[PDB]
Ligand binder design. Structure first.
Ligand SMILES: CCCCCCCCCCCCCCCCCC(=O)OC[C@H](CO[C@@H]1O[C@H](CO[C@H]2O[C@H](CO)[C@H](O)[C@H](O)[C@H]2O)[C@H](O)[C@H](O)[C@H]1O)OC(=O)CCCCCCCCCCCCCCCCC
Ligand code: CLA
Ligand code: CLA
Ligand code: CLA
Ligand code: CLA
Ligand SMILES: CCCCCCCCCCCCCCCC(=O)OC[C@H](CO[C@@H]1O[C@H](CS(=O)(=O)O)[C@@H](O)[C@H](O)[C@H]1O)OC(=O)CCCCCCCCCCCCCCC
Ligand SMILES: CC1=C(/C=C/C(C)=C/C=C/C(C)=C/C=C/C=C(C)/C=C/C=C(C)/C=C/C2=C(C)CCCC2(C)C)C(C)(C)CCC1
Ligand SMILES: CC1=C(/C=C/C(C)=C/C=C/C(C)=C/C=C/C=C(C)/C=C/C=C(C)/C=C/C2=C(C)CCCC2(C)C)C(C)(C)CCC1
Ligand SMILES: CC1=C(/C=C/C(C)=C/C=C/C(C)=C/C=C/C=C(C)/C=C/C=C(C)/C=C/C2=C(C)CCCC2(C)C)C(C)(C)CCC1
Ligand SMILES: CC1=C(/C=C/C(C)=C/C=C/C(C)=C/C=C/C=C(C)/C=C/C=C(C)/C=C/C2=C(C)CCCC2(C)C)C(C)(C)CCC1
Ligand SMILES: CCCCCCCCCCCCO[C@@H]1O[C@H](CO)[C@@H](O[C@H]2O[C@H](CO)[C@@H](O)[C@H](O)[C@H]2O)[C@H](O)[C@H]1O
Ligand SMILES: CCCCCCCS[C@@H]1O[C@H](CO)[C@@H](O)[C@H](O)[C@H]1O
Ligand SMILES: CCCCCCCS[C@@H]1O[C@H](CO)[C@@H](O)[C@H](O)[C@H]1O
Ligand code: OEY
Ligand SMILES: [Ca+2]
Ligand SMILES: [Ca+2]
Ligand SMILES: [Cl-]
Ligand SMILES: [Cl-]
Ligand SMILES: [Fe+2]
Ligand SMILES: [Mg+2]
Lengths: 37, 81, 451, 334, 34, 29, 38, 30, 30, 341
């Protein structure tokens, strides 16, 4: 467990490791925005 | 092209979404309730978690007679008191 | 928007990063931002593990792969690998996470704000792929960096707490390395060992002195090599042997990384020194051996003479000989007799497993360890049901050794494929037929028929 | 030109009936050695103690086998992953008893096929071709590696490598299902999508192109004669073929671009088979198929079987029967 | 300029309507407890 | 268990939001 | 109404996110309630 | 006889490989 | 059965709504 | 130009989804087979026919849901909704396995419909009907496995059930009881499928790597025009490459593509013949010479006898739950087991 002081951020911490994956998806959103030119 | 309107047009049109922002959630909610009300169990004759066995029974209610199978299943269901 | 469509660049959206090949500033951006991705995952994953971490449960029962890495460096653990303080884990995580913000900042800047090319901005930072001199210089810088890293490991081991030593006398513990192995006969000796059974090449390194000395050597080699590559330009034979282009270099490094990936797969699967079983769980060999030990102990308690017990096949039920005669555990685990582990070695004598020691010297901690390792073998399902495929749901477990080995085999394979891809392409492009055959100059049409 | 130069020119010559090349320089002797040893062994090798329990299994024709049952039998469990070349044996008789032929053959062959891949790169380079046929070949190759090298490494013994024989292969598959539940593994499922799909697409392409052949012949001759080798004109009407297929499903489910289509034809089975290979290669380290044994449970807690539990029962039969004298302890850990 | 209720329209909806209903059901099922 | 979904909603939108804002402002996408 | 008013890239992004959500739910269900083995 | 038959068929197949390759009808461009 | 009306009320409300919204174009088409 | 011809006109209009006369058979049957599978796998049990849960509603996942075959006691009943078994009751009919016959029969007629569609469109567009002809292999497989095979056996129960894990079970059953891998017709099947996959792979990769440079782009797909007359890749270079790599090479494109039709189609047809044999337990189960030798000589061992031991395990350990109508009770002591396991 995290130090007690940081425990409030437990759900945030549970979600962070996935963020890199989102960048991959973002690349597609972005490409779709410029019509895959 | 074969005369129908391009899907690109339709799904990016405002009207399409006025319609379907209603019709899709409606359907979804309907299916949801079809389960939550328990209607699905009764329509399809599927056991609820407490209706696979009677309390001290451990024998599967397997159908063993072709022409009186219906009556068999019915008896099996009654056996759950 | 320079080079950002197929028309201007030649590359379709799905090969979009190929548009970055001669845009050194933007390419710099992509690289730094990616480095930020890696550092980000290190930190975030560490904090996730730490939040999900119960100290009195083995690490390997909790799906941890980073905290074990930190613990092996001697941070956070005491005798036997027991967690005595989680704070260092917290620090490693937080500091990586903070650092990733910096890297992502720099990467995003260079990628969509800074000079798109660096050559007109700075002769120091700019580069031409064909400029063999500059290429070997950048290579040099980075070699110096790597050497510095290996030396950081040395410094941790020798001057800042030491490393976790599963082989420490009296039991696994954190130990300061004071006499690292410097003798080149030993160090490169590892490199000249066969990769086959009972040898295992560098994967067989089984004491921390050899590891530390190894990194001393690697650090000096990398720094000297780096200076060398700064101060020289490729010799003629090298010039005539290689393809000199971005994609080619990428292909070389892809080959290297594929090799490294396979090597690491084997490392985490077999080695229990730099991957302590206390943190990573027993190796497959280890657990099989452990089963044999466990039932030898049980049966011998019941009054069985395990040295003379003849199994159904005629071979010893508990004990048999290796093909060269050493006494070893019987049953299928006969394949794993090259296994060595701190809990088994006290029973080993000059000719192998020692029957007197087996009869009189087996300690309770050994029974315990054998039972633990036997019941945490690296076998489990994709949805993390522990045990053989026929086991019923109940135990939530897949060994970290399995996760690490499988992941890195997959990555090493695809990286081999990437090497073939980009090597072949780099050849074709350098020779100039990567886009297809010239109809008016089709080479085969100018060749004699095969028959 | 000096002798070495001449020799290089020959080795890499584009005019040899069969291309040699530098990859060929390694490929030819290793493949020859693997081939010769394989044929001699398959005909005449004595029984081999595969599981290291002095229970020799007969693989050769002269020793009671036909084509379907025969095999070059994997090396002894006693050997594990030890390197067992001919000069490590006291004699050829010992070498044969312990399954030496298997190691000689699979090592020479893995090297030789690797060099076969490389050689495909090499010739593509000499002929001014694009380079990636070798990438397509990497899929069957990866598979070969998976069953002859990787799975043995992970399990700690070449005795668990796939046998060189038809029935031996089936043996391998069944034991594999027992211990890894490979059928329930998504990488094997992708492999099946790969070869079922490859088969589908093979038949589909073959039949669409055959269906759109341009009339160049009379009804008394083969239509094949309507194509001549090296003609610059295409031999079928892809517009007609696409009209057909696009109408069979709908227009945008069909390819109008031959390059895109052929790239699809290459990509689907190659990627699928890549995943098959990786499936074997990762079950090598016992990350197994999905386990939903006893996953469904009623309100009291009674187990409600699914088809997965029936699968489990079959696997159990395989598990308890396989290598019936080789285990002395309750868990089959490798 | 374009019709609305075509053969395509029907086809599409004979698939799409039940699909959304069904997904609603399966969703609900995820919260059933023994 | 609510804060997890809320968080991933904020992060998960943070991505598409950049694209959207830039598209509206006719930025250098 | 006129076609093209809502950007196809937005529609795609939203649709995709919905897909990920519903499938995410189904994988949640593999660990909770019926089918969880618990 | 079985062994002889199996090996004989195999031998014929190898010979066939040889003729199919070195004594094929040569492809000719038009 | 009240459950069939509670369940198939969203479906018929959707049908009625879209009928309301598409009625003029449907009449124009027919 | 009477009503028949007006109808023909309408059926053959060039719309987004072609209908045709064949569409009248095909679309309702394909829709009912698909919908039946989805209905069954979402909502319907297999408790009364197999003693199995098989739906999302019961807690199964994508891999374990199935529409299962009827009880063995139903024999080969068409199991019509209005038949003497269900007698019009939709719920009972579901409980008795009516959806299995529903799906298989509507499915069979749907496959007929689809092949008819292939003929119809080929005729309308002016191409030769080789696609339909190729589709005969899917037909042979479906009819041999889902219809003939159970018809040869005691009942629909031993047909494959429509589900992922259920199919996996079908496979394991065929190994254990039929020694199906030993069967030369299955082997020809495997050669056709793997050979088909190989042809797919190698042809695609070869075409892609003997392309002419027909554009300036490094992404080379755009450098093709569907209307173009010229071959887009070099058959001559392809031929020399494969000639020097493998010894032989295609030189005729027409033959190449016919061959690509021929291999997988033939494979599947052969596999069909084998399953038709297994309908009667007419197996390639054993080699009699093997068994005479092994019976007399307890040191004679091959992979063939090894695999039979595996089969024996499969039958004994799987039969009681896989065949509940038999009421098998195999006491612990009679279960075949090797040492320890
Ligand atoms: C340029 C490159 C050119 C290469 C040319 C070819 C040269 C030969 C290459 C050999 C390839 C594989 C040989 C066998 C590999 C193997 O058995 O690897 C195992 C070894 C480790 O060996 C094990 O090492 C162990 C060491 O542990 C010992 O020491 C430990 C200390 O903690 C513990 O105490 C432990 O219990 C104790 O046993 C033991 O010795 C074991 O007996 C021993 O089996 O890994 C290793 O050496 C290192 C890892 C090798 C990489 C694995 C091969 C990957 C190939 C995949 C290719 C796919 C291609 C697809 C194409 C498309
Ligand atoms: C590791 C993943 C990664 C990285 C680092 C890059 C990086 C890059 N890509 Mg590539 N790309 C990728 C994956 C990646 N790509 C993938 C997966 C695809 C397939 C979808 C592509 C397809 C592709 C194409 C077709 C093109 C690129 C291009 C580029 C470059 C220019 C981007 C640009 O100008 O857009 C502008 C984008 C915006 C204005 C939107 C915002 C983008 C920023 C970076 C988002 C930042 C988010 C982050 C959380 C902010 C943190 C702030 C904090 C640190 C303070 C850039 C160096 C282009 C190029 O080469 O130009 C020469 C180009 O044409 N990419
Ligand atoms: C990592 C690779 C890398 C490389 C090769 C470059 C290169 C460049 N940067 Mg970039 N940048 C980077 C990362 C990198 N940067 C990072 C991480 C950030 C976030 C802080 C930035 C943010 C940034 C901005 C805002 C600007 C640049 C600029 C420049 C250009 C001018 C450099 C200069 O003259 O500084 C002079 C050098 C020094 C003052 C010495 C630096 C002392 C270092 C930082 C001490 C630490 C060293 C140690 C090895 C760090 C290890 C980190 C590692 C563990 C991750 C040059 C092309 C400028 C530019 O492009 O102008 C047009 C510019 O304005 N960079
Ligand atoms: C990132 C690491 C790296 C990279 C990419 C390079 C790259 C290069 N080096 Mg450099 N070098 C390095 C680190 C590196 N070096 C270090 C750390 C040192 C100090 C030891 C040196 C000292 C050095 C010298 C003295 C020279 C180079 C040279 C070169 C150039 C040609 C080398 C070559 O042909 O390799 C290909 C390798 C060979 C041809 C070796 C023989 C081939 C056999 C078959 C290899 C078999 C290896 C086997 C598979 C490995 C298994 C394990 C093994 C222990 C058994 C090339 C640019 C040459 C040059 O041009 O300098 C300007 C040169 O003369 N390097
Ligand atoms: C063309 C499309 C088509 C085809 C080929 C089939 C075929 C089938 N359906 Mg399916 N079905 C369809 C569309 C189709 N269906 C549609 C659109 C629906 C929604 C209503 C259904 C709903 C449905 C259900 C609920 C069931 C079937 C079943 C069946 C099977 C038994 C049918 C039977 O015995 O009919 C008998 C009738 C005929 C063959 C009609 C021929 C009539 C002749 C040519 C004219 C003479 C009529 C005469 C004048 C009438 C006198 C009546 C008087 C004696 C009282 C059969 C495989 C059953 C099944 O699959 O069980 C497992 C079943 O339970 N179908
Ligand atoms: C389960 C019980 C089963 C029992 C059988 C009951 C159903 C019988 C089978 C019906 C199958 C097809 C029905 C839909 C046909 C249709 O959509 O035509 C669309 C037509 C014409 O639209 C026109 O459609 C044309 C486009 S196209 O024909 O759709 O391609 C276009 O040219 C024109 O401008 C446009 O107005 O409009 C209708 O009148 C539909 C009639 C009701 C159906
Ligand atoms: C270029 C490009 C790209 C990419 C990008 C990238 C890749 C970026 C990255 C970025 C990054 C890499 C970022 C990062 C960031 C980070 C951050 C921002 C962090 C922060 C942190 C914090 C705030 C912390 C907190 C805390 C503490 C301190 C304690 C503990 C707890 C907690 C966690 C709460 C793309 C593909 C899109 C496309 C276009 C182009
Ligand atoms: C740390 C450590 C250690 C150590 C280590 C070391 C010391 C290492 C070294 C290493 C090394 C020392 C390596 C090397 C490598 C090399 C390589 C890998 C090579 C490659 C090459 C190539 C690739 C080439 C190619 C070619 C050819 C062959 C022909 C011509 C052309 C070309 C050039 C292309 C030890 C174990 C003790 C312990 C643990 C820790
Ligand atoms: C560390 C930290 C942080 C940071 C964060 C970040 C760095 C974030 C980022 C984020 C992001 C970066 C996000 C993104 C997202 C994305 C998305 C969500 C996407 C999706 C996509 C999709 C869904 C797609 C779709 C599609 C299209 C578009 C087209 C094609 C087709 C498809 C359908 C595939 C904060 C500040 C919180 C603070 C605390 C700590
Ligand atoms: C049977 C029957 C019938 C019929 C009914 C029907 C016709 C139904 C239909 C139904 C339907 C029609 C349904 C549907 C459903 C759907 C679903 C349920 C879906 C889901 C999906 C998903 C889940 C997805 C997934 C995925 C994939 C696939 C890939 C991509 C990614 C993802 C993961 C997203 C009648 C009445 C006549 C009579 C009686 C019997
Ligand atoms: C077992 C590991 C062995 C490691 C060996 C490492 C050696 C490092 C230095 C290699 C020196 C290379 O020396 C290499 O050989 C001979 C020297 O006459 C040359 O020989 C070649 O030259 C030309 C080059 O176009 C060829 O067309 C010709 O066929 C051949 O004569 C090569 O062009 C040269 O580059
Ligand atoms: C690069 C970041 C370095 C941060 C500081 C690392 C201190 S490391 C510290 O050093 C002590 C001996 O000095 C050891 O006893 C202790 O166990 C160790 O954690
Ligand atoms: C099955 C098709 C039977 C066609 S029936 C056909 O229909 C015509 C009008 O369409 C009539 O004019 C004619 O007399 C009648 O025989
Ligand atoms: O499967 Mn089962 O697990 Ca791989 O070892 Mn243990 O028994 Mn044996 O050696 Mn061939 O086989
Ligand atoms: Ca330099
Ligand atoms: Ca309850
Ligand atoms: Cl076996
Ligand atoms: Cl054992
Ligand atoms: Fe083709
Ligand atoms: Mg659930």
């Amino acid at each position: 467990k995290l130090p007690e002081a940081y425990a409030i951020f437990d759900p945030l911490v549970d979600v962070l490791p996935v963020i890199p994956v989102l960048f991959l998806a973002l690349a597609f959103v972005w490409q779709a925005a410029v019509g895959f030119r | 092209t074969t005369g129908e309107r391009p899907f690109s047009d339709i799904i990016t049109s405002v009207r399409y979404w006025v319609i379907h922002s209603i019709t899709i959630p409606a359907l979804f909610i309907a299916g949801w309730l079809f389960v939550s009300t328990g209607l699905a169990y009764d329509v399809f004759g599927t056991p609820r978690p407490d209706s696979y066995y009677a309390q001290e029974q451990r024998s599967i209610p397997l159908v063993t007679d072709r022409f009186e199978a219906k009556q068999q299943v019915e008896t099996f269901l009654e056996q759950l008191k | 928007a320079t080079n950002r469509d197929q028309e201007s660049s030649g590359f379709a959206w799905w090969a979009g990063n190929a548009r970055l090949i001669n845009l050194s500033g933007k390419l710099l951006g992509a690289h730094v931002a990616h480095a930020g991705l890696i550092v980000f995952w290190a930190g975030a994953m560490t904090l996730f593990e730490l939040a999900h971490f119960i100290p009195e449960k083995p690490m390997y029962e909790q799906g941890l792969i980073l905290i074990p890495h930190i613990a092996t460096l001697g941070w956070g653990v005491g005798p036997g690998g027991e967690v005595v303080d989680t704070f260092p884990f917290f620090v490693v995580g937080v500091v990586h996470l903070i650092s990733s913000a910096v890297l992502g900042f720099g990467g995003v800047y260079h990628a969509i704000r800074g000079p798109e090319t660096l050559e007109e901005y700075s002769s120091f930072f700019g580069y031409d792929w064909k400029d063999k001199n500059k290429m070997t210089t950048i290579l040099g810088f980075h070699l110096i960096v790597l050497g510095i890293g290996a030396l950081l490991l040395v410094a941790k081991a020798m001057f800042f707490g030491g490393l976790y030593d599963t082989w420490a006398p009296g039991g696994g513990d954190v130990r300061v390395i004071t006499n690292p192995t410097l003798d080149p006969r030993v160090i490169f000796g590892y490199l000249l060992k066969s990769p086959f059974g009972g040898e295992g090449w560098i994967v067989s390194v089984n004491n921390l002195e050899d590891v530390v000395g190894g990194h001393i050597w690697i650090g000096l080699i990398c720094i000297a090599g780096g200076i060398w590559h700064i101060l020289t330009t490729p010799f003629g034979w090298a010039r005539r042997a290689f393809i000199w282009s971005g994609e080619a270099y990428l292909s070389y490094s892809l080959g290297a990384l594929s090799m490294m990936g396979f090597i690491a797969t084997c490392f985490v699967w077999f080695n229990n020194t730099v991957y302590p079983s206390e943190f990573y769980g027993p190796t497959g060999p280890e657990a099989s051996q452990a089963q044999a030990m466990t039932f030898l102990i049980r049966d011998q308690k019941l009054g069985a003479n395990v040295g003379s017990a003849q199994g159904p096949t005629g071979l010893g039920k508990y004990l048999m000989r290796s093909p060269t005669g050493e006494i070893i555990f019987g049953g299928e685990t006969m394949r794993f007799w090259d296994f060595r582990g701190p809990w088994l070695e006290p029973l080993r004598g000059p000719n192998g497993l020692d029957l007197n020691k087996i009869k009189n010297d087996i300690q309770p901690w050994q029974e315990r360890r054998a039972a633990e390792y036997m019941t945490h073998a690296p076998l489990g399902s994709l949805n993390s049901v522990g045990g053989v495929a026929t086991e019923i749901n109940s135990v939530n477990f897949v060994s970290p050794r399995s996760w690490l080995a499988t992941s890195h085999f997959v990555l090493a394979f695809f990286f081999l494929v990437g090497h073939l891809w980009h090597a072949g392409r780099a050849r074709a492009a350098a020779a100039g037929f990567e886009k297809g055959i010239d109809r008016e100059s089709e080479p085969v049409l100018s060749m004699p028929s095969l028959d | 030109a000096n002798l070495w130069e001449r020799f290089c020119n020959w080795v890499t010559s584009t005019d040899n009936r069969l291309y040699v090349g530098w990859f060929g320089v390694i490929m030819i002797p290793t493949l020859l050695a693997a081939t010769i040893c394989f044929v001699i062994a398959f005909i005449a090798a004595p029984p081999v103690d595969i599981d290291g329990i002095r229970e020799p299994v007969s693989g050769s024709l002269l020793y009671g086998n036909n084509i379907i049952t025969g095999a070059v039998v994997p090396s002894s469990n006693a050997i594990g992953l030890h390197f067992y070349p001919i000069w490590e044996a006291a004699s050829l008789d010992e070498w044969l008893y312990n399954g030496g032929p298997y190691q000689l053959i699979i090592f020479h062959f893995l090297l030789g096929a690797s060099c076969y891949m490389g050689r495909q790169w090499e010739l593509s380079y000499r002929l001014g071709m694009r380079p990636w046929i070798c990438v397509a070949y990497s899929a069957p190759l990866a598979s070969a590696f998976a069953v002859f090298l990787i799975y043995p490494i992970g399990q700690g013994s070449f005795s668990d490598g796939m046998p060189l024989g038809i029935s031996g292969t089936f043996n391998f598959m069944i034991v594999f299902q027992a211990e890894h539940n490979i059928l329930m593994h998504p990488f094997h499922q992708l492999g099946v999508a790969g070869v079922f799909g490859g088969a589908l697409f093979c038949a589909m392409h073959g039949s669409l192109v055959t269906s759109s052949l341009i009339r160049e012949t009379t009804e008394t001759e083969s239509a094949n004669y309507g194509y001549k080798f090296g003609q610059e004109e295409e031999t079928y009407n892809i517009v007609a073929a696409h009209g057909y297929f696009g109408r069979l499903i709908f227009q945008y489910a069909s390819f109008n671009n031959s390059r895109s289509l052929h790239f699809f034809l290459a990509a689907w089975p190659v990627v699928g088979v890549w995943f098959a290979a990786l499936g074997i290669s990762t079950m090598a380290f016992n990350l197994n198929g999905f386990n939903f044994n006893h996953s469904v449970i009623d309100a009291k807690g009674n187990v409600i079987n699914t088809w997965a539990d029936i699968i489990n029962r079959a696997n159990l039969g395989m598990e308890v029967m396989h290598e019936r004298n080789a285990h002395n302890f309750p868990l089959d850990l490798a | 300029s374009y019709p609305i209720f075509t053969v395509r329209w029907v086809a599409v909806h004979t698939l799409a309507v039940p699909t959304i209903f069904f997904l609603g059901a399966i969703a609900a099922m995820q919260f059933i407890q023994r | 268990v609510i804060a997890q979904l809320t968080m991933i909603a904020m992060i998960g939108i943070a991505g598409p939001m950049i694209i959207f804002l830039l598209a509206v402002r006719r930025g250098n996408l | 109404s006129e076609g093209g008013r809502i950007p196809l890239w937005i529609v795609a992004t939203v649709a995709g996110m919905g897909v990920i959500v519903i499938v995410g739910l189904f994988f949640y269900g593999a660990y909770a309630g019926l089918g969880s083995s618990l | 006889m079985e062994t002889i038959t199996y090996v004989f068929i195999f031998a014929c197949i190898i010979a066939l490989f040889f003729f199919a390759i070195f004594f094929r009808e040569p492809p000719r461009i038009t | 059965d009240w459950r069939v009306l509670v369940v198939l009320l969203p479906v018929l409300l959707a049908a009625g709504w879209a009928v309301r919204n598409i009625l003029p174009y449907a009449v124009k088409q027919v | 130009r009477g009503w028949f011809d007006i109808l023909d006109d309408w059926l053959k209009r060039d719309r987004f989804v072609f209908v045709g006369w064949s569409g009248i058979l095909l679309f309702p049957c394909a829709y009912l087979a698909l919908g039946g599978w989805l209905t069954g796998t979402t909502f319907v049990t297999s408790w009364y026919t197999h003693g199995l849960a098989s739906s999302y509603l019961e807690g199964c996942n994508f891999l374990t849901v199935a529409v299962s075959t009827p009880a063995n006691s139903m024999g080969h009943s068409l199991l019509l909704l209005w038949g003497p078994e269900a007698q019009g009751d939709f719920t009972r009919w579901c409980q008795l396995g009516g959806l299995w016959t529903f799906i298989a029969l509507h499915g069979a007629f749907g496959l007929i419909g689809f092949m008819l569609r292939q003929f119809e469109i080929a005729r309308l567009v002016g191409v030769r009907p080789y696609n339909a002809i190729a589709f005969s292999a899917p037909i042979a497989v479906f009819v041999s496995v889902f219809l003939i095979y159970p018809l040869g056996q005691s009942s629909w129960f031993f047909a494959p059930s429509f589900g992922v894990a259920a199919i996996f079970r079908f496979l394991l059953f065929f190994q254990g009881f039929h020694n199906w891998t030993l069967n030369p017709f299955h082997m020809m099947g495997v050669a056709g499928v793997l050979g088909g996959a190989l042809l797919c792979a190698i042809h695609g990769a070869t075409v892609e790597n003997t392309l002419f440079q027909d554009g300036e782009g490094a992404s080379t797909f755009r450098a093709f025009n569907p209307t173009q007359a010229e071959e887009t890749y070099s058959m001559v270079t392809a031929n020399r490459f494969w000639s020097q790599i493998f010894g032989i090479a295609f030189s005729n494109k027409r033959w190449l593509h016919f061959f690509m039709l021929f291999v997988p189609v033939t494979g599947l047809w052969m596999s069909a013949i084998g399953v038709v044999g297994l309908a009667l337990n007419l197996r390639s189960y054993d080699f009699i010479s093997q068994e005479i030798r092994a019976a007399e000589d307890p040191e004679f061992e091959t992979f063939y006898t090894k695999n039979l031991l595996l089969n024996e395990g499969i039958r004994a350990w799987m039969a009681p739950q896989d065949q509940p109508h038999e009421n098998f009770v195999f006491p612990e002591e009679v279960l075949p087991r090797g040492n320890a396991l």
